[PDB]
């Protein structure tokens, strides 16, 4: 009741990312970022220490075809950690087994590419294969794809799930493979817009394919998740979450 | 913390119905459905009791463009009802004002109307003027079409919101239409799933818009939420949920 959480989380930016520093840094202190910046306002505001870790595996977490969990939506299950601490999409899926607080972020899935492509929909891409594209694995964009009905969304899901160099380990790789082939990456939209401001000859292609938040994993029935989702609440009406957001998000300009 | 709980709730077949009896019936024996069933088992596992308020308004809720909200979301949000029990739709705006237990039934929104018609899907209705087409008012269908960004859903919330009719006050009422008018109503699948068992020239046009869950609304913050929660749980491990699904959708065949 008074010992340091446990949080798991994974490096992503701006959320949480590695500071620079001259020397080997250890513990919490290596870590900054969006999702940083929120956690240590919590933790200011509710009276509870942390000890940050990374989630092993790299996965955000996604159930396989045999009903198991992997990454920190998995870390959460098992009760290995007491908060996940990420942009952490909630969605329904993950709400059969774990919990969230309330949403400290909304967006949604859109595409990211290279600029000058006719392409400009997911129906453009769907048909064609000129353009590979894809998403990061074992996370909520790729089981939004798997799950969908609607016929466009089947048919990418259909060429993701053939492809296997089409899903990516992370937005990293991701991103990387838009700027060195012809790869078009579905990705969630707070961070295309990150990525585009900095990354001069990438955009979003098209608009949101849907509208969802991002939200602290608990396991479910945790006895923190309630005074988090509060502290969320309040922040939100004096509009802290929009400056923090503007801090990490703000910057590099473009031509 | 042993006081009955207030449940707020409202009549939608085959969920909460006013039970049939030749006597004027009171309190909490007035209610019978599935959403009823799911309650009781509740409160017999958990050790709690309650009180059946029917919302007001008739609503399930949606917020105004003042952000003002209404129905029995409103209800749980100025903590006048403990719990919604009703098939209230678990949504990223509504998880911004009140929390939910987690997920006890999945569904999607889908199209019902008569038999015989060359419309095959939303791109079908959106595309034409002739069958008129709408949802239930200030809930989460509507909401969902308001917010969409997706253009077939774009063109079918530009109609919506402009034919006054369009609107209905719910399931019912729309139900009503689509039997007496060139009328299809965008409407939860588990609902068009028992109507069509019973009224056999309706039918599904299309398949799953999104997929989503119900849940039992609590104030932001309940300290019942989450038992709620794990008791949803262990029912659902051993069936019960599908069982008393098929008690109260089962029956009537069609031709
Ligand atoms: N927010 C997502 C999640 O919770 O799974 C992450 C972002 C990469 C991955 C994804 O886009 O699916
Ligand atoms: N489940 C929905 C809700 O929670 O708002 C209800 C069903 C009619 C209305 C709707 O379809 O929007
Ligand atoms: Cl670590
Ligand atoms: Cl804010
Ligand atoms: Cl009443
Ligand atoms: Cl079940
Ligand atoms: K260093
Ligand atoms: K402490
Ligand atoms: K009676
Ligand atoms: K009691």
Known sequence: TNRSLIVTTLLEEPFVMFRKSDRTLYGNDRFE???????????????????????????????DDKGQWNGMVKELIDHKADLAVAPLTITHVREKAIDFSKPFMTLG???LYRKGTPIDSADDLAKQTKIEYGAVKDGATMTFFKKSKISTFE??????????????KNNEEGIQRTLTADYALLMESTTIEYI??????????????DSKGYGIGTPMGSPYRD???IAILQLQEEDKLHIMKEKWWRGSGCP
Chains 1, 2 share one sequence.
């Open 227 to 229: 005074k988090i989702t």
């Open 155 to 168: 048919k990418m899901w259909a060429f993701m799930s053939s492809k296997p160099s089409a899903l990516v």
């Open 33 to 63: 970022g969006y999702c940083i910046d929120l956690l240590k306002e919590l933790a200011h505001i509710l009276g509870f220490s942390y000890e940050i870790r990374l989630v092993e595996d790299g996965k955000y977490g996604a159930q």
């Open 196 to 209: 585009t401001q900095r990354n001069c000859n990438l955009t979003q292609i098209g608009g949101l394919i």
């Open 109 to 111: 899935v859109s595409i």
